[PDB]
Structure formats: C-alpha cells, structure tokens
DNA sequence: CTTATT
DNA sequence: AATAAG
C-alpha cells in the first residue's frame, strides 16, 4: 500500500519532520526595533491543564526549549485546548518581506486540461519542519508555569506573520530538482497544500511515488489520512477539481 | 485576553 | 460610538 511503500513520507509513520537541506532561518528586525516583553495574563488551571500535554510533547520533540529572553508574548488563556501565542507585537517589529505566495485563483490557472489525474497532499506541521537560527529563537519566547520561566521555539512558529511565505519559499527550493526531473508533471504549491497533476493514471502513480520519496528524504511529512491519491476528482484549496473544472 | 475592523 | 484573528 501507499502507506507501506513510503514509511518516511507520511506523518503517521515517519516521525516529526525536519527540513534537513534548509539552513536555520534568521529573522531580520526592522531598523528601529527593540525587544517587547508583554506580561502573561493569568491562566486558569483548566486552561493550563489543557495546554500542558502539548507543551510537554513539544519539549520532548525539541521544538520548544527553555530560555531567558528580553522578548515575551502571551499565550491565550481561553484557547479542545491547544496553545495559541499572540505574536502581534513581535510581528510589528519584524522587517516585512514581499508576499510571494500566489492566491489560489491564480495558482489554479496553471492547471491545464491535458492533466486530469490528481494527487493532493498536505504537509503535517509544516512550519515546524523549518529550523530557526539560534539568534532568532529568543524573539518568540513566552512564559510557562507549573503550579518556572520562559520557553521558545526552535522552529518556524504559528502566528508569525512571515511563516507561510518563508515555508512556501523553502519548499520551492527543496522541490526545484523534482520539477526538473519530472518536466511532464504539474506541481502546484500553496504553502503546505500540494497538487500533483499528470496526463495518465500510471504517470500520476509514478509521479506520486517519486514525490513522496522526495518529500520524505527532504524531511517533510504528508498526512496519510487526508491524502487523495491518483483520483480524477479531488478537493484542493476549497475547490472541487473535476472534469477539468473549477 | 487583547486588538484591528448601523 | 459584534466579529475575527494572534
């Protein structure tokens, strides 16, 4: 099965990803920025117990680490509890980058009628596959208490304004060669949502095998549960792709 | 929780 | 002078 043939490619069997070819990211600040330390609003025990096992898993995975930082932003006290960091004051102090992710409408314009066999993959915990340079880690620090200090991220965090664009650009670099090796396949990338299109069932099977092999080797992980493999009809970016339509 | 947006 | 999102 698709599961068995590519253990490394799937999130369910390959472990947490890590994009091994990508240098740890340095996050430039605006020219006038200085650190902001925002106090953590008190969190109820209910919310703290809800959040706690997620924090512990991330610590175990090395995605969070202890730190002491002059930066601090709050975790939401009401966040099915999973921690959500309010990074708006950090985002304001980080230098802007050009938004290079295409909007879905334009992206799908590059899908020709000749290619009507589809594979759709979504990468699991995509931002977390990208390492942050140690110099940039303190930027994203927050407080954590167990009724005691700060933690921060060692990977590109949720809620950071440039994460989608930086991920999209990193994956484009990592999939550049795949595109060159498979000139007859169509590959659409929208941050962590991928569409592979081919002219035949067999070509789509072979391409999908090569894409999974490649993604796994690079350190990314796709959702086996959500995967739509070699169908003439798929759901991609809120559209139903069918009979060359939409 | 905070904060931007008829 | 509810709303959606970090």
């Amino acid at each position: 099965t698709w599961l068995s043939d590519f253990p490394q490619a799937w999130a369910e069997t390959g472990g947490m990803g890590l994009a091994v070819r990508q240098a740890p990211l340095i996050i430039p600040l605006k020219a006038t920025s200085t650190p902001v330390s925002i106090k953590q609003y008190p969190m109820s025990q209910e919310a703290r117990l809800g959040i706690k096992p997620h924090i512990q898993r991330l610590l175990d995975q090395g995605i969070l680490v202890p730190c002491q930082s002059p930066w601090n932003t709050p975790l939401l006290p009401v966040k099915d509890y999973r921690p959500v960091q309010d990074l708006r004051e950090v985002n304001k102090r980080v230098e802007d980058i050009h938004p290079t992710v295409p909007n879905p409408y334009n992206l799908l314009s590059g899908l020709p009628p000749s290619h009507q066999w589809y594979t759709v993959l979504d990468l699991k915990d995509a931002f977390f596959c990208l390492r942050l340079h140690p110099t940039s880690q303190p930027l994203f620090a927050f407080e954590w208490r167990d009724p005691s200090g700060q933690l921060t991220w060692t990977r590109l965090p949720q809620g950071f304004k440039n994460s989608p664009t930086l991920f999209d650009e990193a994956l484009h670099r990592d999939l550049a060669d795949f595109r060159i090796q498979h000139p007859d396949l169509i590959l659409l990338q929208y941050v962590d949502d991928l569409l592979l299109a081919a002219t035949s069932e067999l070509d789509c099977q072979q391409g999908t095998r090569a894409l999974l092999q490649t993604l796994g080797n690079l350190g990314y992980r796709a959702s086996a549960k959500k995967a739509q493999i070699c169908q003439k009809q798929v759901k991609y970016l809120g559209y139903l792709l069918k009979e060359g339509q939409r």
Side-chain angles (χ1 to χ4, degrees), chain A residues 202-217:
Chain A
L202 175 59
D203 277 13
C204 188
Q205 304 175 316
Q206 287 311 291
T208 299
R209 293 185 185 276
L211 179 60
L212 292 167
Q213 182 64 27
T214 296
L215 289 167
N217 292 301

Side-chain angles (χ1 to χ4, degrees), chain A residues 56-71:
Chain A
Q56 184 62 240
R57 181 182 60 256
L58 293 166
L59 285 162
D60 290 345
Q61 295 171 323
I63 295 177
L64 291 172
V65 292
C67 73
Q68 297 181 309
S69 175
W71 299 85

Side-chain angles (χ1 to χ4, degrees), chain A residues 32-78 80-81 83-109:
Chain A
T32 60
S33 295
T34 53
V36 54
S37 183
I38 299 161
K39 248 263 198 79
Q40 174 64 61
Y41 184 85
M43 184 168 291
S44 72
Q45 177 181 100
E46 179 178 62
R48 176 169 55 264
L49 292 171
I51 291 178
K52 182 181 176 178
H54 300 286
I55 302 302
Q56 184 62 240
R57 181 182 60 256
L58 293 166
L59 285 162
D60 290 345
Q61 295 171 323
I63 295 177
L64 291 172
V65 292
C67 73
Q68 297 181 309
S69 175
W71 299 85
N72 195 83
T73 44
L75 291 192
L76 302 194
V78 208
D80 61 311
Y81 279 104
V84 174
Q85 189 172 10
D86 179 5
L87 284 171
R88 284 174 300 173
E89 290 297 321
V90 164
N91 285 337
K92 291 182 193 183
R93 287 165 172 84
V94 167
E95 182 77 11
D96 292 338
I97 64 176
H98 190 63
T100 58
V101 183
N103 56 65
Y105 190 100
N106 288 332
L107 183 65
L108 280 166
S109 80

Side-chain angles (χ1 to χ4, degrees), chain A residues 130-237:
Chain A
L130 294 184
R131 294 170 289 177
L132 225 40
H133 193 286
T135 306
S136 295
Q137 294 179 9
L139 184 55
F140 300 105
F142 59 92
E143 199 178 333
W144 185 249
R145 288 326 185 63
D146 59 17
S148 272
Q150 285 168 300
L151 307 179
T152 199
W153 303 92
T154 65
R155 315 289 181 86
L156 195 62
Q158 302 288 333
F160 172 46
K161 69 173 176 187
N162 291 343
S163 289
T165 298
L166 293 170
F167 183 83
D168 197 63
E169 291 177 0
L171 188 61
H172 269 291
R173 295 190 294 272
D174 275 344
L175 292 183
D177 180 66
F178 173 88
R179 292 177 180 277
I180 292 174
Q181 302 311 324
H182 305 266
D184 295 311
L185 302 181
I186 299 285
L187 178 60
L188 304 185
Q189 295 178 229
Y190 185 77
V191 193
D192 55 358
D193 298 306
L194 310 181
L195 171 74
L196 187 72
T199 56
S200 67
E201 184 176 33
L202 175 59
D203 277 13
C204 188
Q205 304 175 316
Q206 287 311 291
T208 299
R209 293 185 185 276
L211 179 60
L212 292 167
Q213 182 64 27
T214 296
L215 289 167
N217 292 301
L218 293 165
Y220 304 95
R221 302 294 188 255
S223 173
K225 186 177 183 181
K226 298 201 281 183
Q228 306 167 76
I229 298 179
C230 296
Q231 315 175 345
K232 302 225 59 180
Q233 188 162 332
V234 299
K235 294 165 60 180
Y236 182 63
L237 303 185

